[PDB]
Amino acid sequence: TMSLGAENSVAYSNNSIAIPTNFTISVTTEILPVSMTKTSVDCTMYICG
Amino acid sequence: DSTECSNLLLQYGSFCTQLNRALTGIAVEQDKNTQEVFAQVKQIYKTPPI
Amino acid sequence: FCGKGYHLMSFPQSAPHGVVFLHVTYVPAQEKNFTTAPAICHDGKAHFPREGVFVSNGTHWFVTQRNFYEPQIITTDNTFVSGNCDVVIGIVNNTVYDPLQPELDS
Amino acid sequence: NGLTVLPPLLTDEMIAQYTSALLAGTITSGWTFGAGPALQIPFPMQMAYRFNGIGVTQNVLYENQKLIANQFNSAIGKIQDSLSSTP
Ligand SMILES: *[C@@H]1O[C@H](CO)[C@@H](O[C@@H]2O[C@H](CO)[C@@H](O)[C@H](O)[C@H]2NC(C)=O)[C@H](O)[C@H]1NC(C)=O
Ligand SMILES: *[C@@H]1O[C@H](CO)[C@@H](O[C@@H]2O[C@H](CO)[C@@H](O)[C@H](O)[C@H]2NC(C)=O)[C@H](O)[C@H]1NC(C)=O
Ligand SMILES: *[C@@H]1O[C@H](CO)[C@@H](O[C@@H]2O[C@H](CO)[C@@H](O)[C@H](O)[C@H]2NC(C)=O)[C@H](O)[C@H]1NC(C)=O
Ligand SMILES: *[C@@H]1O[C@H](CO)[C@@H](O[C@@H]2O[C@H](CO)[C@@H](O)[C@H](O)[C@H]2NC(C)=O)[C@H](O)[C@H]1NC(C)=O
Ligand SMILES: *[C@@H]1O[C@H](CO)[C@@H](O)[C@H](O)[C@H]1NC(C)=O
């Protein structure tokens, strides 16, 4: 049975905050298709030669 | 279950393969959609008891 | 929309029948716990952060920007006053420095 | 007649678990968990940050915190009643 993710119980309280002291410059990739191959079919030539 | 019908159906080619492939693509697409919408966090957060 | 994290910039790259976006994003890291309060009570007045948040390392109170830890002394220049201390729930008592005070003191 | 229904990859309890994780992240950490590690913040302070996002000062949220909480609870109850009462 698949596991969704690791459990991470956030330590919530009414008077505590978590402030970052450092940072990471992360570069991620996103691939998006833009076009397809331009195909033309001669209907008469395809069906009848 | 008709053998004769299947034999005649084979003359038309790979129509059945095309339809099955399209339905399989739709079926995997639905799961991909559910993953995209709901599985956006890799940590399962939980609320405090209080 | 433009990568995981706070988006800084993006770079386009051509691909066969497609585009690849290199998303440069800012990710917070190395977080630390601090004790926080909504407002600071000083001279019977409630002080709220102009752009940051009040944090405490255990004994002293400072104001810092929300996305990076940079503690600064709580002054009148980075806080604003609205109302007294009787309305805000969870207000704590701390001093608020005045930059103008040494100028007329000297 | 040859028709089959494939079960979904994510079951209802797992989808509910995902929604629960999202709710816990957005309540306990605000928007921090969506951009990186989940940073805890008190919920009134988070609401004050959201108020600042739409151009309203923090003092307005803090002074009228009880009224805002009452309005939010009333609205959530009205949402449940409206869903239960509308076909
Ligand atoms: C913030 O994290 C960076 C890493 O991204 C730390 O930089 C490293 O510092 C150590 C010790 O000075 C070096 O040995 C590493 O080579 C550094 N890494 C890089 C990529 O330069 C940085 O010191 C951290 N800052 C704080 C305040 O924790
Ligand atoms: C901030 O404080 C909380 C609690 O004071 C810390 O949460 C605990 O961390 C320990 C260390 O791994 C765990 O064993 C506990 O189970 C955590 N408690 C809960 C309720 O999650 C938290 O790690 C602290 N964060 C920082 C950055 O110091
Ligand atoms: C919280 O931060 C303040 C500011 O750095 C700390 O105050 C300094 O503490 C050191 C060591 O005790 C002293 O040498 C400095 O003179 C203090 N500066 C001031 C302006 O008082 C404070 O100790 C920190 N609190 C904790 C619990 O670490
Ligand atoms: C924060 O400061 C205020 C005012 O200096 C404190 O309020 C006083 O509390 C004492 C003790 O109950 C009363 O006798 C005074 O009449 C109060 N004065 C005012 C103006 O309200 C308050 O108790 C302090 N809070 C903390 C946590 O130290
Ligand atoms: C947080 O809750 C405790 C009790 O759980 C209470 O005594 C304290 O005053 C609360 N602090 C704030 C800022 O609401």
Side-chain angles (χ1 to χ4, degrees), chain C:
Chain C
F1 190 66
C2 309
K4 178 56 71 180
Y6 298 117
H7 171 240
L8 289 173
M9 56 205 302
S10 297
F11 297 121
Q13 295 286 271
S14 61
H17 300 303
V19 60
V20 173
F21 292 106
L22 303 195
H23 296 302
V24 187
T25 59
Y26 173 102
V27 176
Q30 298 182 248
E31 68 271 4
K32 169 162 192 53
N33 281 341
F34 295 97
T35 301
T36 189
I40 292 299
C41 182
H42 179 64
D43 295 332
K45 288 178 300 281
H47 303 256
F48 302 94
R50 270 189 212 185
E51 68 272 14
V53 60
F54 294 136
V55 288
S56 168
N57 61 342
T59 55
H60 284 146
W61 281 96
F62 305 99
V63 58
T64 182
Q65 57 185 281
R66 308 162 180 171
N67 301 303
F68 185 79
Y69 182 50
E70 185 182 271
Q72 285 182 352
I73 304 297
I74 296 168
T75 66
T76 57
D77 287 2
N78 44 30
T79 56
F80 67 92
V81 171
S82 178
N84 47 7
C85 307
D86 293 331
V87 180
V88 180
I89 301 153
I91 187 164
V92 302
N93 291 350
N94 196 82
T95 190
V96 169
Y97 177 79
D98 204 302
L100 193 144
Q101 183 66 41
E103 312 311 305
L104 82 157
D105 270 16
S106 306

Side-chain angles (χ1 to χ4, degrees), chain C residues 4-6 26-29 31 33 36-38 48-50 52-53 66 80 82-83 87-89, chain D residues 31-40 42 45 48-49 52 57-60 62-66:
Chain C
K4 178 56 71 180
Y6 298 117
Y26 173 102
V27 176
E31 68 271 4
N33 281 341
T36 189
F48 302 94
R50 270 189 212 185
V53 60
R66 308 162 180 171
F80 67 92
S82 178
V87 180
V88 180
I89 301 153
Chain D
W31 58 79
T32 68
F33 80 108
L39 317 172
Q40 72 260 16
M45 300 202 67
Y49 281 18
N52 291 14
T57 58
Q58 281 190 347
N59 67 269
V60 177
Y62 295 134
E63 288 157 356
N64 307 317
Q65 183 182 330
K66 182 177 68 68

Side-chain angles (χ1 to χ4, degrees), chain A residues 1-37:
Chain A
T1 295
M2 63 181 288
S3 62
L4 272 65
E7 183 190 333
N8 197 342
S9 174
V10 174
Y12 175 81
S13 71
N14 62 350
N15 67 329
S16 178
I17 202 166
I19 305 295
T21 68
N22 209 335
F23 40 77
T24 298
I25 300 305
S26 171
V27 177
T28 59
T29 51
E30 177 162 24
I31 296 100
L32 283 175
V34 170
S35 55
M36 319 196 297
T37 297

